[PDB]
Amino acid sequence: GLKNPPGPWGWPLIGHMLTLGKNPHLALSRMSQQYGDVLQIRIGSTPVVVLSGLDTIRQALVRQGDDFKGRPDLYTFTLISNGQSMSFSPDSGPVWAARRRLAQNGLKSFSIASDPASSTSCYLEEHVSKEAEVLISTLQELMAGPGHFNPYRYVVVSVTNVICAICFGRRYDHNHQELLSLVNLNNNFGEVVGSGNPADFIPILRYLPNPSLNAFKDLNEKFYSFMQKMVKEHYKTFEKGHIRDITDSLIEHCQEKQLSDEKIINIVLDLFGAGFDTVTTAISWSLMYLVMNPRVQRKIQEELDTVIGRSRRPRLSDRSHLPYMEAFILETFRHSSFVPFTIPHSTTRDTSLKGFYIPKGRCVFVNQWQINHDQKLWVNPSEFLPERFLTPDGAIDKVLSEKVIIFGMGKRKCIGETIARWEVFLFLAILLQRVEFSVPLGVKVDMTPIYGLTMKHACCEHFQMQLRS
Ligand code: HEM
Ligand SMILES: COc1ccc2[nH]c(C(=O)N3C[C@@H](CCl)c4c3ccc3[nH]ccc43)cc2c1
């Protein structure tokens, strides 16, 4: 038959806003244990259905994909890309799918396709090798200097120049101030649009003195200013036959052609933003796990010494033949789950899920964190143990690696998964082959994640690095 989704009691005006608290991913996981994989809360007066369970989510996002492919009409999204963001706009219909096809093509055309200037590698491998070595020599300068560094500061530039080369054909010095301007100055994007923001559900918090949202509104049109001054710089030097960027890839499509040319050109912003921010957090988390688990660091290097040695620079060729790193990366994604919730979803129409009615327009949270820490899928899920993914013969258990959910599911799946998987692998491979990372004893290193759409960690200034052998 049909039932309504269960759920706990909530306050008549604010709902469950206080039981979510500072860490919705944790509050809604405990709630799932009691009420199950399909439950119901209210943030203010706005109902929300929360989805947990590996297969319950797969059933909704994949098997009933177009019932669950929408995006809710939340305020914070209206301030992203002038209210016309592909990834955050309410547009779910054909206008959206088209822009998604243009971003998928522009991505693979200037990332995995072979570089004309190299018979060896693809675009992505060239860029990541360049920044990987610049980053190493940069980091050495700092041990010669202060003797210690915060890695996030310099990884964010090296990561950004990769996605900045795929998109704008330009890179920036590690101290270019108009860049830290963008990517390393009051970047609270993730913390504001993380699922459950009070300002999206409490209409008066948008008008009261809100520093966190004033910083947010200035960040987004400071990024929209950057985009317009790089596409105008590109149309001044654009040549029909020779496409250099993803930007020129879209300028081309504007010429060939409800699909505004604004809606085509501001796609590169969604790529540039998700590119630099997410991959950076992954690498930064990986290095926070290497410092705090030296055993895992050496066994990564031990594998690199036996499968490639120190005679040659690693390549994407070697990704398939390095199982223990694929395990470390998978466990960095799983233990941290630095993307605890997908971007909120919305129902396109009345539908049902595991026997529960959900009407059209209902806001939906997808608790990826709950999957990666479900104690019935993982033995000891709070422990960082990459070995959990390795078979008795030292290979990757592919069925258990496909239970790690961090790139979403269904028709709204991340379109930069393989880029992020290759970029994260290559960066870590080139660095760990030639250097080791360390934090002296007696220093504080808070591993506690900070909630957000992409959870970050507390800044750590005490990283050290020395070369090997
Ligand atoms: C570890 C790195 C990354 C993670 C964990 C990640 C995660 C996600 C998640 C959870 C979603 C939304 C899922 C949903 O809405 O159901 C998403 C969407 C998206 N991702 Fe990623 N992402 C990563 C890297 C990247 C990169 C490198 C790019 C571009 C080069 C990218 C581009 C996008 C875009 C454009 C969307 C919007 C898709 C849509 O809403 O239709 N992401 N990502
Ligand atoms: C869950 O991981 C995801 C999944 C989907 C995503 N989308 C985006 C994204 O579209 N943008 C747009 C862009 C402003 Cl247009 C921007 C971001 C993100 C951080 C940013 N910092 C400065 C600008 C900026 C990030 C992201 C992360």
Q: What is the DSSP string of 334-381?
A: HHH-SS-BPSPEE-SS-EEETTEEE-TT-EEEEBHHHHHT-TTTSSST
Pocket test for ligand 1, best of 247, 278, 284, 346 (most atoms within 8 A of CB): 278
Tabulate helix, strand, coil % of the chain (nearest 5). Answer: 50, 10, 40
Closest CA to 338 of 291, 278, 404: 278
337 lines ligand 1 (CB under 6 A): no
Count Cβ atoms below 10 Å from residue 15 Cβ, excluding itself.
20
Ligand 2 environment, Cβ below 6 A: 80-81, 87, 187, 189, 219-220, 223, 269-270, 273-274, 277-278, 339, 343, 453-454
Dihedral angle at the C-alpha atoms of 191, 192, 195, 196, nearest 10 degrees? 110
Instruction: Please state, in angstroms and rounded to a whole number, the distance separating the CA atoms of residues 105 and 176.
Output: 30
The atom number, within ligand 1, closest to the CA of 413 reads 13
Per this entry, what is the length of the chain? 469
Ligand with minimal distance to 193 CA: 2
Phi first, then psi: give them for residue 111, nearest 5 degrees.
-135, -60
355 CA distance to ligand 2 centroid (A)? 34
Phi, psi of 172 (to 5 degrees): -130, 145
- Domain encompassing residue 301: 1-469
Which ligand has its closest atom nearest to the C-alpha of 338? Answer: 1
Cβ of 20 closer than 6 Å to ligand 1, yes or no, is: no
Name the binding residues for heme: 414
- Cβ neighbours of residue 435 closer than 8 Å, sequence gap 6 or more: 136, 139, 465, 466, 467, 468
Shortest-distance atom of ligand 2 to CA 272: 13
Q: Which residue has the tokens 């990834």?
A: 87
Residue 109: closest CA among 306, 237, 249, 289 = 249
Report how far ligand 2's centroid is from the alpha carbon of 57 (Å): 23
Rounded to the nearest angstrom, the gap between the alpha carbon of residue 131 and the centroid of all alpha carbons in its chain is 20
Ligand (nearest to CA of 85): 2
Q: Are strands 435-438 and 46-51 parallel, antiparallel or unpaired?
A: unpaired
Interacting residues of 338 by C-beta distance below 8 A, sequence separation 6+: 281, 282, 285, 406, 449, 454, 455, 456
Name residues whose C-beta falls within 8 Å of residue 219's C-beta, 6 or more positions apart in sequence: 186, 187, 188, 189
Domain count, the chain: 1
Closest CA to 217 of 398, 15, 81: 81
Neighbours of 94 (CB within 10 A): 10
Cα–Cα dist 255/248, whole Å = 11
Element (H, E) at 146: none
Ligand nearest to the CA of 364: 1
> What are the residues facing 363 on neighbouring strands?
48, 346
Residue 271 beta carbon below 6 angstroms from any ligand 1 atom: yes
Closest to 365 measured CA to CA, from 340, 383, 344: 344
- CA 455 from centre of chain: 9
Burial degree of 64 (CB within 10 A; 0-12, 13-18, 19+): middle
Spatial distance between the Cα atoms of 180 and 188, rounded to a whole number of angstroms: 14
Q: Which residues are annotated as a binding site?
A: 189, 414
Write the CA distances from 462 to 136, 156, 257, 297, integer angstroms.
17, 17, 53, 17
- Partners of 456 in the β-ladder: 450
Distance CA 213, CA 199 (A): 9
Please tell me the distance between residue 165's alpha carbon and the centre of ligand 1 in angstroms.
18
CA distance 32 to 8: 11
Q: Is 165 in the pocket of ligand 1 (CB under 6 A)?
A: no
Burial 112-151 (b: 16+ CB within 10 A, else e): eeeeeeeeebbbbbbbbbebbebbbebbeebbeeeebbeb
Give dist(CA 189, CA 267) in Å, integer: 17
The amino acid sitting at 105 is: N
Among 109, 414, 424, 428, which residue has the most ligand 1 atoms within 8 Å of its CB, making it the best to mutate?
Answer: 414
Of ligand 1's listed atoms, the one at least distance from the Cα of 87 is: 40
Q: Taking a C-beta distance cutoff of 8 angstroms, is the pair 16, 10 a contact?
A: yes
Q: Is the CB of 230 under 6 A from ligand 1?
A: no
Which pair of tokens denotes residue 253? 């499509």
User: What SS3 state is found at 169?
Assistant: coil
Name every residue whose Cβ is closer than 8 Å to that of residue 441 and which is 6 or more positions away in sequence: none
> Of 469, 447, 466, 467, whose CA–CA distance to 458 is shortest?
447
Give the method of determination. X-ray
CA-nearest residue for atom 25, ligand 2, is 274
Separation of 300 CA from ligand 1 center, angstroms?
27
Q: Tokens representing 48? A: 């929300």
CA–CA distance, 103 with 129 (Å, rounded to integer):
24
Report the distance separating Cα 358 and Cα 312, nearest Å.
56
Task: Report the nearest-CA residue for atom 7 of ligand 1.
Answer: 407
Q: Which residue(s) pair with 416 in the sheet?
A: none
Cβ–ligand 1 distance for 253 under 6 Å, the answer no
Count other Cβ atoms within 10 Å, centred on residue 108. Answer: 16
